[PDB]
Structure formats: C-alpha cells, structure tokens
Amino acid sequence: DDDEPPLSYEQHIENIEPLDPINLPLDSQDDEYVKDWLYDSRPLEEDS
C-alpha cells in the first residue's frame, strides 16, 4: 500500500530466514565438477 512507509530492515526482515532459491535439481555424476560452486554468489571466489 502506498499509505504505509517502507518497512525497516532490521525489525521486519533481518531476523527472518530467507527462503529457498531457484536452484535446479543438479546431477551428481554428470555435474560433479560444477555442483560445488555453480550457485555460489561469487563462484570460486577464494580458489587461488
């Protein structure tokens, strides 16, 4: 509603658990190399 202000993050959002994301089932054998890191936020971010 346009009457209500945008709700504060720390009271109404920060505490709640997020939800499941849109991740494909994923194969275990065909997709072995990529299933560890395909859905990371930054993939392979600390892999030197």
Binding site: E10, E14, E17, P18, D20, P21, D40, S41
Partner: protein
Amino acid sequence: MPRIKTRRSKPAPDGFEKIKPTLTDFEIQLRDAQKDKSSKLAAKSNEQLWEIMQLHHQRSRYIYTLYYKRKAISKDLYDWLIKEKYADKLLIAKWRKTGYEKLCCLRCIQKNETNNGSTCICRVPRAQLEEEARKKGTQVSFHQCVHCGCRGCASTD
C-alpha cells in the same frame, strides 16, 4: 559470508557454543542502540553514534583476546567469525601492530580525512596532553573524540 544465515553460509565450528551466549548479548545491545532514540541535541545524537562504535569495538576486542591473548578458540572458528562478520578483519589487524594495540577506530588513524594530515587527538598520549596543560596554564581542553568519543587509545594509557 553474509551475516544472514543463508543456505550459502557454512555452519558453525565446534567451540562456538561456549562463546555464543556472550556474542548474542553483544548483538542485542547493538539492536537497542539503533532504535531511533529521538533527541534534539547534536551533542546527544553523536553520543548515540559513540555508543555504537563502543559496542562494536568491545565485541571485536573480546574475539581478539580469545584467539590471541588466550588462544581459547580454534583457528577454524576464528576464521569463521571473520567470514561471518562477527569481528572486524582490519581493526584486529591494527591491534597486532605494536603501536596500535589499543586502537579506537579505523577512522582515528587516518591522516587523509582530517584537515591537516594528522591522526585524531585520542591517538595522543595523555601525559603529553597534560604537559601542554602545564605549558598553557590551562587544564586540558579535550574530552572525547568526535568520531567515537575515545578518551585515549594511546598505548601508554
């Protein structure tokens, strides 16, 4: 990596629950400080900022003392705390250096932000500040740093 317990977040290491009750107690203090205590003074509003910089300092100082002074947490836990934002990576690192072990803030050392290229006053030893109070004949005209309110991070003090 995010403070939120996402699915991406790696679960807790082993020694965490022995220090979780203190860490939650620092957390609830931080939630209280940000509650929009509406004040009128500018002197009161930045004191509310000064309490927040104090609480966040105290939490990281505790985690620093556990890993380095007491070695009572594992390194896998201690890296997990830093990756999950419970402690400040850089503020801890300054404490390892021999001059900056009682450091107020990352903000306080910075030469660039100030007018002249100097650290803030709360980086000067008090006994030196007492000396110009002897020189000027006037008691020391410093009480709290503006960007935290510190009263001497100085290692000698």
